[PDB]
Paper text:
We now obtained a new, trigonal crystal form of MsCI4•thalidomide that yielded a dataset with a resolution of 1.2 Å. The crystals contain one monomer in the asymmetric unit (ASU) in space group P3221, which has the same conformation as in all other known co-crystal structures of MsCI4. This structure superimposes closely with the 3 other monomers of MsCI4•thalidomide from the orthorhombic crystal form and the 2 further new MsCI4•thalidomide monomers described below. However, between all structures, there is a significant difference in the conformation of the thalidomide molecule: while the glutarimide moieties superimpose tightly, the phthaloyl moieties protruding from the binding pocket differ in their orientation by up to 13°. This angular freedom is especially apparent in the atomic resolution electron density. An obvious rationale for this conformational freedom lies in the lack of specific interactions of the phthaloyl moiety with the protein.
Ito et al. showed that cereblon associates with damaged DNA binding protein 1 (DDB1) to act as a substrate receptor for the DDB1/cullin4 E3 ubiquitin ligase complex. In mammals, cereblon has a LON domain and a C-terminal thalidomide binding domain. However, homologs of the latter, also termed the CULT domain, are further found in animals and bacteria as single-domain proteins, that have all essential residues of the thalidomide binding site conserved. Architecturally, the thalidomide binding domain is a member of the β-tent fold, which consists of two antiparallel beta sheets that are oriented at an approximately right angle and pinned together at the top via a structural zinc ion.
Numbering used by the authors: 18 to 123
Amino acid sequence: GASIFRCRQCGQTISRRDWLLPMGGDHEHVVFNPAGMIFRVWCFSLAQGLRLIGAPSGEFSWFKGYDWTIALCGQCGSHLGWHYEGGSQPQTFFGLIKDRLAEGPA
Ligand SMILES: O=C1CC[C@H](N2C(=O)c3ccccc3C2=O)C(=O)N1
Ligand SMILES: [Ca+2]
Ligand SMILES: [Cl-]
Ligand SMILES: [Cl-]
Ligand SMILES: [Cl-]
Ligand SMILES: [Cl-]
Ligand SMILES: [Cl-]
Ligand SMILES: [Cl-]
Ligand SMILES: [Cl-]
Ligand code: NI
Ligand SMILES: [Zn+2]
């Protein structure tokens, strides 16, 4: 059974369970933004359906050695998470907010 992560707002296909990545040994990280809100961040090696906004930034990065850019759903513009770059093994990956996705069957 393929298990698809869809944009919770609009239903667009974004990623799948098979594309989870154990970043630092763990494909689901618990992180705090600077306002103190807690996110569960799924780590994916690949994703579809995403528009990236801005130049990379390293500030506040939750993943050492990686800079982020904001990832929006291309269809509806929901803020789904971030793309990470500038690392090694892998160079890049996606960190997507669990509450902003919905996991279900194909
Ligand atoms: O790895 C990341 C991605 C971006 C994220 N981030 C936020 O969630 C945020 C909210 C408010 C102002 C500034 C930021 C910031 O860098 C953050 O804290 N770390
Ligand atoms: Ca975890
Ligand atoms: Cl899958
Ligand atoms: Cl990590
Ligand atoms: Cl964690
Ligand atoms: Cl944190
Ligand atoms: Cl969350
Ligand atoms: Cl952000
Ligand atoms: Cl949103
Ligand atoms: Ni895993
Ligand atoms: Zn969407």
